[PDB]
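Weekly puzzle thread! Below is a chain. First person to post its structure in token form gets bragging rights.
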Amino acid sequence: DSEMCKDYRVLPRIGYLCPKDLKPVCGDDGQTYNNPCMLCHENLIRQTNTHIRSTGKCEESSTPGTTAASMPPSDE
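Winning reply:
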């Protein structure tokens, strides 16, 4: 998580260091990052301090509509 960027270091030959565990994270900037440490990577390129919005891929994969609308019936 961003807490890992609180004290990390990247070089032209070292680059960024991340764990081998693959875990999809959601970005507070509306973007998703495959691996969690891979998210901080987007922070070094954009330099916007993007953190994780929620564990797992963002909710973008979910339908754009709301399940509450399904509650009520529809003419068609």
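Puzzle host: Confirmed. Bonus trivia for everyone else. The domain at 1-58 is CATH 3.30.60.30 (Wheat Germ Agglutinin (Isolectin 2); domain 1).
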